[PDB]
Amino acid sequence: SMSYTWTGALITPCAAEESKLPINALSNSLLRHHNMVYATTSRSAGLRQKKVTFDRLQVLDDHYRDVLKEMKAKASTVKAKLLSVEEACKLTPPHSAKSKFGYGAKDVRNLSSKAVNHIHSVWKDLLEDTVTPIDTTIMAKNEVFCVQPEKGGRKPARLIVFPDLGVRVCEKMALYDVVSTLPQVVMGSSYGFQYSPGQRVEFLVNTWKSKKNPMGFSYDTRCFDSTVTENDIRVEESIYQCCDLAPEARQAIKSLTERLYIGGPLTNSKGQNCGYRRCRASGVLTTSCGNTLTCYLKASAACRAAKLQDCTMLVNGDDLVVICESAGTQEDAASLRVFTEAMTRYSAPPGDPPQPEYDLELITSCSSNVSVAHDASGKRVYYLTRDPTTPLARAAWETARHTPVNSWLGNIIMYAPTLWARMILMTHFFSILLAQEQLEKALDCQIYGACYSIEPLDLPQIIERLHGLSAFSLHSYSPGEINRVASCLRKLGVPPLRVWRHRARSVRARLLSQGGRAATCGKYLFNWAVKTKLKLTPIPAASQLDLSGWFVAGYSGGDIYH
Ligand SMILES: CC(C)CCn1c(=O)c(C2=Nc3ccc(NS(C)(=O)=O)cc3S(=O)(=O)N2)c(O)c2cccn21
């Protein structure tokens, strides 16, 4: 069937849309080539509509069914609980889109009677009706990128499809425990969202050296959400139903699948029918889990089809990387085409065709790659990094505009050991924070699709817990990494790293002057900026701030707050 059917009604904005980078007094200190940074808007939605719209055909063989049977066997060991309304309400972001039915997210969060009555209303309807399609809103995302003159020009807006706030609370009640716990049980070590950045690097490195002659590839599915068929969504459901569940949860999971997950009508922000979806909704609770299960299923089956030797997979939703035994370059190339042929029969064709890699550092997955530095004692250390272009374009946007999500903060957290996050991101945003005296002000950020409120003053504690103390001491980065950073800087008109070292010594001194947690920030975050360094010991406050639920599961589009 067609992934989408369209009426012709436009996908409409909800708020003001800016496409050119906002400029203020801080902008040039970060980035000079302003016209290279852009945000996508609804203006491009029509183009995105074109590319997400195609017919899907699926051809399912014994390999597919074999792997599914294995997955279901593991699923059957999961016992999951229903969340109460109140529990579900507390998982709602303070800034989540308001209900069409006369209440918003803050009404949900403090359990207003209007919100709770309506939520109980929605739940009862799910239990009683297993057929009526549930309405969804379709919006164009506003995301920030750098122009890619060769690779394209400007990316069209991605589309987000989501049901009403009352429905989203019900999804949590039915499925939050399932989507949090089932992926690791079914996929074990291949489930990517269980890992911190450091744990992901370790899994990648251990898997690489566990092979006699390693080969690896990332597999990029063309518009993965659009490739997800009614079959795939019913198969996901059958996996969920393997769990030990309350009878009400079984019924609700069945309604939500038939009424929402499989497809339904698409409404714009003006209330017009835009058409109909028959593929994955990007803004539902099960988006991450559904995608991960489906990607893992098709790929495991495809490896058996291509006869890949000892294939290990790492799956984060639609993001897939495979490490296996090499059969030499020409055979590996042949094997990947067969893998791709099988994935294609399964309705997951490639965007850019997969290429075999024999150097772990050249494999990019979840927009990231393994690289090497040295800790204080000269020991070689693997850590996770990425091309800094997008993070830096977004930092530029966030320099002049308060955004719902502060990408810079998430990027400091996740990419703390990197050269570019330490020298540019920490330096730039701490300087801003000092000047506004907003070190103490909690900021929203996203990690694995979930929203978190975080105080920049807790960064040292958070970084130690995720990465270790070595994150504050790394040096002697690789020539490939240094080269990529310097080149990105030249491209965007970012001051050279020598300038950042200079600003950092200033930021460091100012923080240390402040005393307290601010001083701890100066000491730990910026120890790299001094010629002779303080000895970095574990900070006492690092324990009590518990990172509960940080790397359990992914929740992209799932409207989750912690
Ligand atoms: C160590 C890290 C894997 C490094 C990179 N990184 C991430 O991958 C993600 C991340 N991974 C994803 C991958 C694939 C999907 N696709 S889907 C829609 O669920 O099918 C979704 C996500 S996400 O929205 O859950 N966020 C981050 O939140 C983040 C923050 C800062 C770095 N990251």
Swiss-Prot record:
Domain RdRp catalytic: 214-332
Post-translational modification: The N-terminus is phosphorylated by host PRK2/PKN2.
Modified residues (Phosphoserine): 29, 42
Signal peptide stretch: none
Topology in the lipid bilayer: Single-pass type IV membrane protein
Domain of life: Viruses
Recorded catalytic activity of this chain's protein: RNA(n) + a ribonucleoside 5'-triphosphate = RNA(n+1) + diphosphate
Reported cofactor(s): Mg(2+)
Localization annotation: Host cytoplasm; Host endoplasmic reticulum membrane
Binding site for Mg(2+) 2: 220, 318-319
Known partners and oligomeric status: Homooligomer. Interacts with non-structural protein 5A. Interacts with host VAPB. Interacts with host PRK2/PKN2. Interacts with host HNRNPA1 and SEPT6; these interactions facilitate the viral replication. Part of the replication complex composed of NS2, NS3, NS4A, NS4B, NS5A and the RNA-directed RNA polymerase embedded in an ER-derived membranous web.
Designated name of the protein: RNA-directed RNA polymerase
Organism, scientific name: Hepatitis C virus genotype 1b (isolate BK) (HCV)
